[PDB]
From a paper:
Here we report a functional and structural genomics effort that applied saturation-level transposon mutagenesis and next generation sequencing (Tn-seq) to identify essential genes in B. thailandensis, followed by high-throughput structure determination. We used an “ortholog rescue” approach to maximize structural coverage of these gene families, which are likely to be essential not only in B. thailandensis, but also in related, but more virulent, Burkholderia species, such as B. pseudomallei. Using only seven Burkholderia species to select orthologs of essential genes, we solved structures for 49/406 essential gene families, and for 56 total Burkholderia protein targets (including seven ortholog replicates). Of these 56 targets, 25 satisfied criteria for being a potential antimicrobial drug target.
One strategy that has been employed to improve success rates is to “rescue” such proteins by adding orthologs from related species to the pipeline, based on the assumptions that many of these will have slightly different physical properties that may improve their solubility or crystallization, and that close orthologs will have structures sufficiently similar to the original target to be useful as surrogates in drug design. By using an ortholog rescue strategy for insoluble or difficult to crystallize targets, we increased our structural coverage of B. thailandensis essential genes from 31/406 (7.6%) to 49/406 (12.1%).
Author numbering:
A (entry chain A): 3 to 254
B (entry chain D): 9 to 254
C (entry chain F): 10 to 253
D (entry chain G): 10 to 254
Write the structure that this text describes.
């Protein structure tokens, strides 16, 4: 027996692709800012948005307008460059996730190469922390990178669920799932909080939300994709409900 | 499908009957529920025709793309209508106070012969029969003795529970009642009073074949739209079931 | 501009059929306002068949727009209305002795009662409306009561069995609107209106507000409440603006 | 009484962002028909920026209403349009050398090319619309090409920065319609129209069909696709019918 309760597993909603849609036409709509606040009303525990150097989807006005309006938590994804880090320390989001943008900054799987850029990342982690931001590193589920993330001082890691999501068949999906599971264990063993989310959708998130060690799933595209047919409030509420049901039933 | 959802459409008819027009149309509701993931449509032709009326059942029966579950009382008029229509499934429910226990399930012990004969009459018309009963040892045992292959447990007290403690105690009656029915070779269903925050623990029980759910879906549908309400409930149950199996 | 009043009564109907708190008429009202409703309407019946007293009391201080309280001409219900101080009250017939055969309030027949109820609600700062048939004599009686608003019974128009009958019943409403506006009355409508018969009524310039209930709930079950309300509002505004 | 063409380009825009099959432009198309759309519109661009050949090829046999294919006046795409045999085609500018400063197809300037294209498509049984500005010189030339339909560029109306500018531009669209009907053309519109500016355009009795794209997808994100389509149609019908009576 158990009580269902929303605190069991947090959902971060990524609003980037609402921006993709708005930028397509050039008007202010559909508004990413309204998207974020409506997601909070629908049960999102944080709002996630990636301010790219090249400002391809989310733009600066989106971040600056939304920051003071946020009811829950802002999770600002950004690159490890001095100028973006300055923006992050000025805006003071509750959380930040350091993500690679330039190819020299990522691995072949797609996570931050914390190993190869160790000093720069440890410094970023320090200044963000000095400005009161809880820092996460978006990394591959590779034990060396996880260990390296822990050495940087970052309290959080976000594991890259892309290969899990894009698995070609069930045998390959299970293998990638095991990489994630053992990534979570190694991260927890070092006292890191561990998140996930990349590529997760309405039929592959359950197996991930059933992992007791995961704190928060940060989900973007799939929610927007489901919203077009179903409506934003419902797409959010539904993904949250599925996550919570998987989490709780797997615990007891 | 890891677990089946039957969507009950009675309270769509409640809305319709309040106005006297054909809208909102229960028949549309039922076919759309199937399109959004329902494995069966449940409907209760009461003797007093309070919500669902005969024409709703007759129109729906040849259209249904999954399974029809007809709820009805144990009386000749209704049983004969059921045998004429030949739904895939029927669930015998009480409509008179003399037919129900205080908990509100069918009093199979007190009306054993009438119920056992009903079971025979429907089984002859090719209908899979279920008895709507309390999670009560005596009633479960009696149900097995009627020859009906299915029971649906009355999850009302569980659903209506006020505290964590009271709901825990009622949950274990249901869990116990599932184990008992399975041990006698019955399929066990549930669903009365189940909604979007109490369905998960019941779906987590692997012995439950199908949850037949009504008012919670229609109530949520008002705000969220019917396709979404059904889909979401199905998603939550499957997530609960499969996560608990592994 | 044309106003939509959303009647939440049949949300309460769905709730009372199971005995839980859901669907919550209070939440339905507050979300109708978010979706564009200009007022919320609810009929506290003497027999509390759908909406109940706790519904009206809980919602009243939360209203961001206007509350239109439908109730009968009896002292208890008038006492409750004067205590709640809704923005609007619409006096409706409940007893068979208060009904015309068409179904509106017999204001001619209960003039003194209705006038006193008007004075009583007006003293409590409530803008009073009388639900009536599109009948010139009732419209006149309505005006003599001192009520500033009338709501015309569009149910015959709504339930017309064919186009000829529907057009004649439309002409009656149109004439009623002219008659009521010629006396200084605000005129409302809405009984039985839905998504393919509201347009013609919305197109009449003299209509201030359409108070619509069951059609929005029936649509919302498939479409969602927010959508159903916003859509009715948009259709109404489309019709009105194009008509001018 | 008035038709709604639902343009599905920006559903694909959303799909290509991620590189999976979702959200599926084909599903959107079919669900729009169920919601009341009279036609499905898609622009197969020469660079394939949103809609791709698979979308158009897979959607075509499944279309229950009619397909309106937007494509450019060049052999490759015209040859494709003839393969697909959509019910309607709308010729539109894609290169800087084919469009006016306002953004319409420079029909007067590419007359021989457009006339040939109208011939080729009509001989494949496709009914041809030309996307043009509401300028008399271009409407007259459109008629000269043999094309039975024109679609007026409502973008300047839609982008108007004040009430006065919006009246001026509205008058251009209105007189553009008169001028087109006078030559026996069917006249459409659609570019830039949304849920608070479509009404004045829908009130014009001469307008056959509104082809609307981005406003619906943008609304759909919050309210759901079926609802955004149905609601656009109902506002169009409401405004049209009330304008007639
Ligand atoms: C489908 C719909 O939109 C409903 O509103 C319905 O078709 C009419 O409602 P009535 O029940 O009021 O006739
Ligand atoms: C305001 C709204 O909800 C959108 O539906 C609107 O369509 C915006 O349209 P634009 O794409 O024209 O800004």
């Amino acid at each position: 027996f158990f009580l269902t309760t929303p605190a069991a597993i947090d959902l971060g909603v990524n609003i980037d692709h609402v921006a993709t849609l708005r930028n397509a036409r050039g008007t202010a709509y559909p508004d990413p800012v309204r998207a974020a606040l409506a997601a909070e009303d629908a049960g999102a525990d944080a709002i996630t948005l990636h301010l790219r150097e090249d400002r391809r989807h989310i733009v600066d006005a989106d971040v600056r307008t939304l920051r003071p309006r946020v009811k829950t938590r802002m999770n600002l994804e950004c690159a490890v460059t001095p100028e973006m880090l300055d923006i992050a320390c000025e805006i003071r989001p509750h959380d930040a996730c350091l993500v690679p943008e330039k190819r020299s900054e990522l691995t072949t799987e797609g996570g931050l190469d914390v190993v190869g850029h160790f000093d720069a990342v440890r410094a970023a982690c320090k200044q963000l922390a000095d400005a009161g931001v809880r820092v996460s590193l978006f990394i591959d589920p590779d034990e060396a990178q996880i260990r390296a993330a822990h050495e940087t001082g970052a309290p959080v890691i976000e594991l890259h669920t892309g290969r899990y999501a894009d698995a070609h068949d069930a045998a390959e999906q299970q293998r990638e799932f095991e990489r994630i599971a053992t990534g979570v264990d190694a991260g927890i063993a070092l006292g890191l909080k561990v998140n996930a989310g990349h590529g997760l959708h309405y039929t592959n998130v359950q197996a991930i939300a059933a992992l007791p060690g995961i704190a928060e799933l940060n989900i973007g595209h799939a929610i927007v994709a489901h919203a077009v047919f179903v409506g934003w409030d419902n797409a959010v509420r539904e993904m949250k409900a599925i996550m919570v049901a998987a989490r709780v039933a797997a615990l007891h």
